Every structure is written in C-alpha cells, then in structure tokens.
Amino acid sequence: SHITILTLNINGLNSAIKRHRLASWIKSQDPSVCCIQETHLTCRDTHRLKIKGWRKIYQANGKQKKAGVAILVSDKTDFKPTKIKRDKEGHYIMVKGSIQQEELTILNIYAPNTGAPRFIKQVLSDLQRDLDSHTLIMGDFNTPLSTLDRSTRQKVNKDTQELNSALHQADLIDIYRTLHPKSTEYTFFSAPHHTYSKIDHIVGSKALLSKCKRTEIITNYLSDHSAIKLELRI
Template sequence: MAGSSSHITILTLNVNGLNAPIKRHRLANWIKSQDPSVCCIQETHLTRRDIHRLKIKGWRKIYQANGEQKKAGVAILVSDKTDFKPSKIKRDKEGHYIMVKGSIQQEELTILNIYAPNTGAPRFIKQVLRDLQRDLDSHTIIMGDFNTPLSTLDRSTRQKVNKDIQELNSSLQQADLIDIYRTLHPKSTEYTFFSAPHR
C-alpha cells in the first residue's frame, strides 16, 4: 500500500456451494494454506439462516450476503492478522453482492464482491456499479464471478461478443476500472472453475 512497507493479498474463489461440511472444511484448509489478508468467495449457497456455518479459525471478520434460498451467496473474509476496521457494509438481499468499505492497515479501501446471475450478467453488473457509484472510488477493488467473459481470452470459441458485454466493458473503462488479472496475465486462460464450454 502507498507509503507503507506492508502489503495485502486478496484471493477470490467461486466455491460452488458450502452446505456440505466437507466443503467448508476444504475451504478452511485452502484459505489457511494460502494465508491471504482477504478472501472473497462466491456461490456459497448459504441462506440468511446459515451465516453461522461459515467459520474459520483465525478469520473472525466474515461479512456475508445471502438470500432466502440456497443459491448465490457471497462473503468477504478478513484474516485476524489484518488490521481492518469496517465503516460501511452494503448487501444484496438476494446474495449477489456485498460491499465492505473501511480501513485496512490504516489505508481506506472498498471491496466489492460480486456473483452475477447466470442470465443477464452484464446488465446486472452495470446496475450494481450504478447503484453503488457513490461508494466506489480509486481505492476500490471489485472481484468475484461475473458469469460473463470480459476478454476474448476468457471465451470459448462458440461464444460471441454481444452488445451487453461491449457495454459492460465500456462502463468499466469509463469508471477507470482495470482488470488486474488480465493486466498481470495478458495471455493466460486459467480459471478456478471450468464449466463444460471451457474444458
């Protein structure tokens, strides 16, 4: 972070459901082995009544957005080793996004974790960015599972670049948002989850 010798690491992962205890255990072990400052997860499939299920030793700061049904669901987990003080939290009632604003290692930071619906993802993301635009600034990190390929490298050969994706990319550029993964890995085609079209 600017003016500081410390740094933070942020990971994101689509977990494709955490209702089974074995999956929660595997996630906890993976997070502990990676040892990030912050971990954002999508598609927890937890309901509002299930918030107590997501527990990881050394990770007491867990912010979740879950719906009424066992679908969607997102969470932002902050390591106990990380000096984090939240100042504002906004949750989607369906569990498709959570925004946490605060200070981390004495630096202001906004983290927005999105799990976009399978259909209409570009329009959904544009709407979230519009709804939260007053909260997003140059200290914002947006991550998650957008359920839409923003780059041609992220598309299967059968997928076309449609108008919605073009408009979303335009909106991201207008907001001065940068795809950090694509910047650091301009030719990579690796994913944390492969759906049938990508295999």
C-alpha cells in the same frame, strides 16, 4: 505492507463437511482477505460459516439456498470496516474499510448465469456512489470480459462491451488482464463445447495498479472454479 486478496466460487457451503474443507484450503493459501461466492447459505444460516483464523466475516444472503457471498478477513490483518452493503438477494456484498490508514473498498459479486454483464452493470450503477479510486471488484462475473478470456476467443457480446464501457467510465480496469495482456489462463473448464473460459475476475481502480505486485490463478480440487489471487502493496 503486503496483503493478498483471494477470490473463489466455492460451489456450496451448506454442509459442515464442505465448510471444514474450505477452511483447510484457506489456511494453506493464507490470504489476507478472501472473497467467496455461492456459499448458498440462506440469511438464517450465515452463522454456520466459521473458519478459525478468519474471525472477521461479512456475508450477504438471500432467502434461499442459492447465491450467497462472503468476505473473510485474516486475524493477522488490520482491516477496520466503515461501511458494509449487502445485497438483499445474496449476489454481492461491499465492504469499505482501512488497512494501516489506507482505504480499500471490496465489492464481492456473484453474477447469475443468465444476463450476467447486464446484471453487473446494474450493480455498478446502484453502487456508483460507493466506488472510488481504491476499489476492487472481484468474483464470479459469469462472463468473460475480452476474447482472450475464452479458449475459443469468441467475440464478447454487446452487453459485455457495455459493461466494459461502464467500467472504464468509472476508471476501473481488469487488473488481471492489465498485468497479463497476452495470457490464456482460465478459471472454468466446462464451457459449452469442451471449452474453457475466464469468468472469474479481479477488476479495480486504475490508481490501484501502482500497488499490484502479482496475480495468480490457482486451480484447485475444491470447486469447479479456479481461484484468483492478487498481491497488493499497501
């Protein structure tokens, strides 16, 4: 009745060397479900991503070696998919399914560097029909959601404020920030002027809060992004 969901922008998987490296890290972390961003695999190279122990994999890829997302499910986890929706451009993938008769919807997103919060709000609208009370939206938003997400505590811009409102209209909350309202933890440590920011996020339905046992930010040597882990009581 416990599953862990892990998100990491992996910064490219095209080379077999990097794929082998990612696989070892996953084996260690032993997540039930893993959301990866920036695989950079074109839609004709998706078959390249194989990780022993995580046979169920769902990918979304554009026509070029940029963006690219994947959701990997552990062989030990009974996830039964019912709907998969893939971005033509490789910036998100949504998987709906059930674990032990419990519905879960996972939207893995990689937002672009330019116009990130507007882009996420658009995807929310495009998929408004697919969001529900058991929805997790995780990945590299390429934007803070509040001042505490930046070591500078710079006010978030109007667009971000709009994204935050669209999220609340759908009864979606920043799950990390809700469990850790005062924390100053970061996932990207090369922000502009020697600054740090939390641009990776785990957002989710308010009704999932009762199931959230723990979150953990996992700094690593694989990527220029730290991973985020969520422990969920199914």
